């Protein structure tokens, strides 16, 4: 089977930039085709970041998010996303989802924790 690997929590400080790691683990002998990656905030309407195998990246606001490991012309396996300028409202759970064929969609939830200053 194809399984999404990610930590449960990602800590970051107020004003800093943090990267939410999210990788797709597929066995060496198992065949899969990943069409696109999707980040969504737990409790919102739609997605905040999408990377398509041919169309490239798309963000709800391009200045705040960036796929740090996804690249056109390569296997979509690493959906790690960097968030710039952490504010207190960025605290919450985020869903990292892989669209694979023929296994289907695989997702995981990551708790982004924004920390205060000393």
């Amino acid at each position: 089977d194809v399984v999404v690997q990610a930590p449960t929590q990602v800590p970051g400080f107020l004003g800093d930039s943090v990267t939410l790691p999210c990788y797709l683990q597929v066995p060496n002998m198992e065949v899969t085709h990943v069409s696109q990656l999707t980040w969504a905030r737990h409790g919102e309407s739609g997605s905040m970041a999408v990377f398509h195998q041919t169309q490239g990246p798309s963000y709800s606001e391009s200045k705040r998010l960036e796929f740090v490991a996804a690249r056109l012309g390569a296997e979509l396996r690493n959906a790690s996303l960097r968030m710039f300028g952490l504010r207190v409202e960025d605290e919450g759970n985020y869903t990292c989802l892989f669209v694979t064929f023929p296994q289907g969609s695989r997702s995981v939830d990551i708790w982004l924790r924004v920390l205060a200053k000393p």
Binding site: H33, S35, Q36, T38, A40, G43, S45, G46, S47, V50, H52, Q55, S58, L97, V99, F101, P102, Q103, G104, S105
Partner: protein, 219 residues
Amino acid sequence: LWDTTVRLSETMTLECVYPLTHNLTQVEWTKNTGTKTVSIAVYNPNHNMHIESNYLHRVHFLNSTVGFRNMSLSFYNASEADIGIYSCLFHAFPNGPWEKKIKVVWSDSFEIAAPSDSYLSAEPGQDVTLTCQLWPVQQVIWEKVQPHQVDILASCNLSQETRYTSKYLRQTRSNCSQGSMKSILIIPNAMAADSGLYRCRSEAITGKNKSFVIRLIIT
């Protein structure tokens, strides 16, 4: 937890039509048992339609054309094992996922438990306003009741967490106000197809639930 409830029958169809203009990336059907996900079907434009071996001779797609905007799941001979909550998940760029949840239950005609409390009619082409005639109400639901299925048109809530997006294909206008008021549902440019039963379900914190059913007739 679900957007549509359909009655279990031999050749039942779980309706699912993608309502957005974005080009599809992949569509998937899944079923939640109690907490686990069985894959039923996966369609991707770069491959052939994939149906799992457990469902190869159990389900098929009857109302689809090229592109598979309509991914309604029809059953050849549906049994007790097909009761559950299904997930119709469209993926597209750059919008992302669009999901519809269908709960299959064992029941009789849903119209039996929904007797009409009011008769409203209107001529074709008008914006029909369905006013619900229903401390400590918590959740309000507008739904269209048919013998074979019940579709949620609007789900309003004040305190708890929901900004509910109706997966009903036909365009309706809902209002999730904050002053506890006459919950209204607007059917813009109502036609003869909009006729039927519309039920206003209020759910209080006690667990009490009250229903108000309007029969809409568009000649």
